[PDB]
Design a protein around this ligand. Structure first.
Ligand SMILES: Cc1ncc(COP(=O)(O)O)c(C=O)c1O
Ligand SMILES: Cc1ncc(COP(=O)(O)O)c(C=O)c1O
Lengths: 323, 320
């Protein structure tokens, strides 16, 4: 269908920019960068012989732009180059080059509120058993699309009903490491499918030890007696998570990575979720069991509000897109 | 390169030449209804097949103009699709017809054909409305690919048991559903670079034999032929190896196999659509028996290649 790039959010702390996309611009509202070319979404295609597809031999990051400012761009590209190195990928561009191109890509979409995926793959120039690393030709692929909300505005305000998956667990670090962001979502998709079977909105997975892990596209945070905790092991080192723990410490709470049991999840004062794709939101029940009184808690509410302020308040967290 | 002189009496390419006028000669893909050359075989980065690897596939081969075990391959593909709740947008008959025609267009008498079914680009992962899903089929046919060279089919291969990674459990990403999610397989390949071995074998979370990147392992001991039952793709080559083993009068079974049984084996071998059957003559530098290929493996290897040329229901002729 047609492109939807702004909304009236029911929420005083989230406001889209007031502007119009130019219909003569074939990149307006969405675009990719593929092998040196800025192209429209319908032409955003990669080789089926790229190992990024047939062996998912790839890592990526996803950042966002809000009111014409990219949020924590440095952290994101640094995390991306760290993940590349963890899987022995040498990026074909420097971090600076990648920032320059991603920011120009956003600019060409004219999008003031955007999500930008930067992906690095092993390439199509070699195959998986290639010993000679000089034969590997890694690729960079980028997309900039309208901002996407994992949970709608009304659930950011009223909260989401969480489900702990029983039919599947998060892939162990000794197989496919969740700390390296990747497209290998077999377990995460099974979890989604289980939410369909059980009638819930979002799943959280446990790890091999039955400790909280993460969900598809989000980290979970658990608050108890003024201590703010988030899973340290089987979870992506989220940049939203990092922000949430910084805000928590600002509010005077102990904020740490930790192992969290399911009993501690059920017994929490407050539970929330976070991600670049939607910000921060409350989880007000788990498996149909209320967290406290089943409405978003006050700590969660101040975290959410503060996260959105950090998206507009001038600071080193914000990098202006040159439209 | 689409032919070789193999130096092996039981492996022989066809004698022919590709027509250079034909832009699909020697390799091609089938993408969204179109037969295209390799260079134009691209898919949408908004296909969930890419960004969530929401996809399954199979790879069958063609030898001397015949597809080998095509029925088994497409049955496995459709079972794997059903396992991840994928409704293929084509029937098994249709996939076979398109795939055989793809091969015909490449003129390849020896080839590997990948058939992939993805969740598509018309929806995103959280879409609850399954009628919105629009799965895509992508196919490719390229020259036959050898996981191990001809001289090592003859002489045998030096195996390594991966210690820095294990095979993904069935409770996360099921190895019995053929998939592109090779993060662990790639790590194992990298560990073989580090430790100086040719191929890796992975263990499962219980430390029992799993499989390797692109191959099943088979362990032979006191006349009994065994292959890992759990953390392993149900290979079509594996199936053939066990049928061959039975025909030779050996007990042939899937089982749980320990590392001690691997080192203590009479014979070990590997198998794959991408290269047939080959010997593993050492593990972690320790000889399997006398460190040369064993007679059971050699018999199985030869019979496998025989099954690739003797007329039977195992072979489907491509109409070039
Ligand atoms: C599996 C998973 N966990 C967590 C996150 C959130 O991380 P970040 O806050 O850096 O977006 C994502 C984002 O896509 C994800 O895919
Ligand atoms: C992980 C894995 N195991 C086993 C096999 C062997 O399966 P088959 O004999 O059906 O080709 C493959 C083939 O690609 C594979 O990728």
């Amino acid at each position: 269908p047609e492109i939807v790039y702004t909304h009236d959010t029911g929420l005083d702390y989230i406001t889209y920019s007031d502007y119009e996309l130019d219909p003569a611009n074939p990149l307006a509202g969405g675009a990719a960068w593929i092998e040196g070319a800025f192209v429209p979404p319908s032409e955003a295609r990669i080789s089926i012989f790229d190992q990024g597809f047939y062996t998912s031999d790839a890592t990526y990051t996803t950042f966002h732009v809000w009111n014409g400012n990219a949020f924590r761009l440095g952290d994101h590209i640094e995390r991306l180059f760290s993940n590349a190195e963890s899987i022995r990928l040498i990026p074909p561009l420097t971090q600076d080059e990648v920032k320059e191109i991603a920011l120009e890509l956003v600019a060409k979409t004219e999008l003031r509120e955007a999500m930008v995926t930067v992906t690095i793959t092993r390439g199509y120039s070699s195959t998986p058993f290639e010993r000679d690393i000089t034969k590997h030709r890694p690729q960079v692929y980028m997309s900039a699309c309208p901002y996407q909300w994992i949970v709608p505005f009304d659930r950011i305000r009223d909260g989401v009903h969480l489900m702990v998956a029983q039919s599947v667990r998060r892939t162990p670090r000794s197989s496919i490491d969740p700390q390296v962001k990747n497209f290998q979502w077999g377990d995460l998709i099974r979890a989604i499918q289980e939410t369909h079977d059980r009638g819930f909105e979002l799943p959280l997975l446990l790890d091999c030890d039955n400790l909280l892990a993460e969900g598809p596209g989000f980290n979970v945070v658990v608050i108890k007696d003024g201590v703010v905790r988030s899973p340290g092991r089987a979870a992506l080192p989220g940049i939203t998570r990092k922000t949430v723990l910084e805000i928590a410490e600002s509010l005077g709470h102990e904020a740490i990575l930790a192992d969290i049991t399911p009993a501690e999840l059920y017994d929490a004062d407050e539970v929330l979720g976070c991600s670049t794709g939607g910000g921060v939101w409350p989880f007000v029940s788990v498996d149909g069991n209320s967290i406290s009184d089943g409405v978003p808690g006050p700590v969660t509410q101040s975290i959410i509000r503060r996260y959105w302020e950090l998206n507009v308040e001038p600071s080193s967290l914000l990098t202006p897109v040159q439209y």
